[PDB]
Amino acid sequence: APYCVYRXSWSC
Amino acid sequence: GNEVTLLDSRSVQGELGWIASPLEGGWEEVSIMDEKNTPIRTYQVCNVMEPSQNNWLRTDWITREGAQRVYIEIKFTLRDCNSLPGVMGTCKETFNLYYYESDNDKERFIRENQFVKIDTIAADESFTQVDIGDRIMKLNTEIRDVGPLSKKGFYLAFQDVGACIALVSVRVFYKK
């Protein structure tokens, strides 16, 4: 999966 | 005034359904909802922990109409390797931008070496602010000019080689 997801802020 | 838009990801009705190679595990469509609950359709990849990445993502066929010289405006955000916990010697803080000139608007499997390189895009001095209600996305904004084009249309491609990228917006235009 992606380690981090940009949603507004990056979420790792 | 004199700008004619040839592609705007923010305006496309429904899914973008660009072409990801690879199809799973590379670039993926991620929807950030604005204050009205209208999708903002981003493309994201963040396999920074994993070596030898080569992830492509290309657009639909884009007509150039009359113009020889097109302008590409991308709004994105990159996680710096510095800020991402993990040992990751192949982490990168750029991506590459490519184009392919074709008369054929249903090209299916265009290959890597047919693509022609525009630039390496990095987070740099310029940024923008996109107020979506609950947040304000602060994003990098880069523009490149490509040409001279001489075929009915073209394809844009973005290559990832180990970065943590969100492409939030892609506009392509020319000046009439």
Element (H, E) at A6: strand A5-6
Annotation: CATH topology of B1-176: Jelly Rolls (2.60.120)
The nearest CA of chain B is from the CA of A1 a distance in Å of: 7
For A1, B14, B64, B81, the CA distances from A6, given in Å and listed in that order, are 13, 20, 31, 15
| E-assigned strand segments in B11-163 | 19-21, 28-33, 39-46, 55-58, 62-63, 70-78, 94-102, 116-122, 127-131, 136-146, 153-160
In this complex, do B85 and A4 lie within 8 Å of one another by their Cβ atoms?
no
3-state helix, strand, coil in chain A (%, to 5): 0, 35, 65
* Contact yes or no for B148/B124 (Cβ under 8 A): no
Q: Where are the domains of chain B?
A: 1-176
| Three-point CA angle B9, B65, B75, nearest 5° | 25
Residues 6+ positions from B125 with CB-CB distance below 8 Å: none
Residues 6+ positions from B88 with CB-CB distance below 8 Å: B48, B49, B81, B162
One-letter amino acid at B86 equals G
Picking from B45, B53, B79 by the largest number of A CB atoms within 10 A of its own CB, the best residue to mutate is B79
B52: left (phi over 0), alpha (psi -120 to 50) or beta: left
Out of A3, A5, A8, whose CB is closest to B84? Answer: A3
**CA closest to A7 among chain B residues:** B32
Residues 6+ positions from B117 with CB-CB distance below 8 Å: B96, B97, B98
Picking from B24, B29, B44, B169 by the largest number of A CB atoms within 10 A of its own CB, the best residue to mutate is B44
Alpha helices in B58-117 (DSSP H): none
Q: CA B75 to CA B9: how far, in whole Å?
A: 11
The nearest CA of chain B is from the CA of A11 a distance in Å of: 10
